[PDB]
Structure 1
Amino acid sequence: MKVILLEPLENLGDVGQVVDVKPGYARNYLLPRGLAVLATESNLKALEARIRAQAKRLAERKAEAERLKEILEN
């Protein structure tokens, strides 16, 4: 069963990563303890749209810096 980790779990996966676990593990351990969420279509988009937003506000930083490296350095 595919789940999206909400946290880094040792010998499991990284936060935001999609891993495969047995249904019992997900239903009776991860989901109740807030450690993961079902890799459903609905929030596979939620993860995706946040990976997209994080990249958006990052490349905006690496370009509002360069526009300052423009004025300075000259």
Structure 2
Amino acid sequence: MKVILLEPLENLGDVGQVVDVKPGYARNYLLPRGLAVLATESNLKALEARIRAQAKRLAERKAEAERLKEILEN
């Protein structure tokens, strides 16, 4: 069963990663303990859209910095 990890998990996976676990593990351990969420379409969208926003918010620095770098060094 596919779930999205809200935490890095020892020898399981990394935060934001989509891993495959047994239904029981997810429902009776991972989910209730806030350690993961079901890889449903609705938050696979949410997962992706946050990856996208972060990549955008990163690029805005590397671009804004580089613009600052243009001023300096000259």
TM-score normalized by the length of structure 1: 0.99
Q: CA deviation at 1:15?
A: 0.1
Quote the Cα distance in structure 1 between the aligned partners of 2:26 and 2:71: 53
Fraction of identical pairs, as percent: 100
State the aligned residue count: 74
Q: 1:65 aligns to what?
A: 65
- Provide the secondary structure at the position in 2 that maps to 1:11: coil
TM-score normalized by the length of structure 2: 0.99
Q: CA deviation at 1:7?
A: 0.1
Moved over 3 A (4+): none
> What is the correspondence of 1:1-74 to structure 2 with a 5 Å cutoff?
1-74=1-74
Quote the Cα distance in structure 1 between the aligned partners of 2:47 and 2:65: 27
Q: CA RMSD in A?
A: 0.2
